[PDB]
Amino acid sequence: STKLEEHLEGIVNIFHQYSVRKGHFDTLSKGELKQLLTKELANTIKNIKDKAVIDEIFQGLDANQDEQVDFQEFISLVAIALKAAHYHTHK
Amino acid sequence: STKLEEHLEGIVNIFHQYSVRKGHFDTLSKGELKQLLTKELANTIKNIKDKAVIDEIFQGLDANQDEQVDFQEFISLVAIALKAAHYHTHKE
Ligand code: NA
Ligand code: NA
Ligand SMILES: [Zn+2]
Ligand SMILES: [Zn+2]
């Protein structure tokens, strides 16, 4: 298992330590996602100098509350944070 | 600084360890990217049962082998790989 594979597993692991808490073990409510993002990306968020980017991380987490967040939807948010984090390494 | 942030940091580091080697420090050749994927995702690849997912990870890489690939293209592959990683934590 490479360092890259350990990071992928690590990201899955973080999703799961939230998703297992309530409801279906493999999804999150939008409320739980929002808590996850606010805490687990707190620095990434502080350092992002274009707030469109913040808004984009949080887009739609205050409506369609009946619809749950699966890992696929989480991957999309990870992709956004991975761009933000790259960019920050060049600041 | 959070554990999640460290994984993002690490993935960026890995990319950089290949992108810096030649020419522009922030892009790599499709050929270099094939080397990265084949080595850094070695076990991920074996565990993938779906040949189509494997072809998707290597899509486009043998044609235009000297074409430059940037971090964003690398993000797309990370996403594919993350889906596979997830799928595989649930293997029985
Ligand atoms: Na859940
Ligand atoms: Na390069
Ligand atoms: Zn899962
Ligand atoms: Zn870079």
How is B2-42 classified by DSSP, letter by letter? -HHHHHHHHHHHHHHHHHTSSSSTTEEEHHHHHHHHHHHTH
On the 0-12 / 13-18 / 19+ scale of CB atoms within 10 A, B46 is exposed
> Does A67 show up as a binding residue in the annotation?
no
Query: Cβ contacts (< 8 Å) between B26 and chain A: which residues?
Result: 90
- Ligand 1 center to residue A70 CA distance, Å? 9
Query: Which of B1, B3, B6, B11 has the most A C-beta neighbours within 10 Å, making it the best mutation to test the interface with A?
Result: B11
- What is residue B52's three-state secondary structure? helix
> Does B47 show up as a binding residue in the annotation?
no
- Residues B52/B70, Cβ–Cβ less than 8 Å: no
Experimental technique for the deposited model? X-ray
| Domains of chain A: residue spans and CATH | 1-91 (1.10.238.10)
- What is residue A72's three-state secondary structure? helix
> Does B50 show up as a binding residue in the annotation?
no
Question: Which of A58, A88, A54, A1 has the alpha carbon at shortest distance from B39?
Answer: A1
Cβ distance B4 to A40 less than 8 Å, yes or no, reads: yes
* Cβ-Cβ contacts under 8 Å for A60 (sequence gap 6 or more): A30
- What is residue B87's three-state secondary structure? helix
Which H or E element spans position B68? strand B68-70
Tell me the structure's resolution in angstroms, rounded to a single decimal. 1.7
- Residues B87/A15, Cβ–Cβ less than 8 Å: no
Sign of the alpha-carbon dihedral angle for B75, B26, A51, A4: positive
CA A35/CA A40 separation, integer angstroms:
8
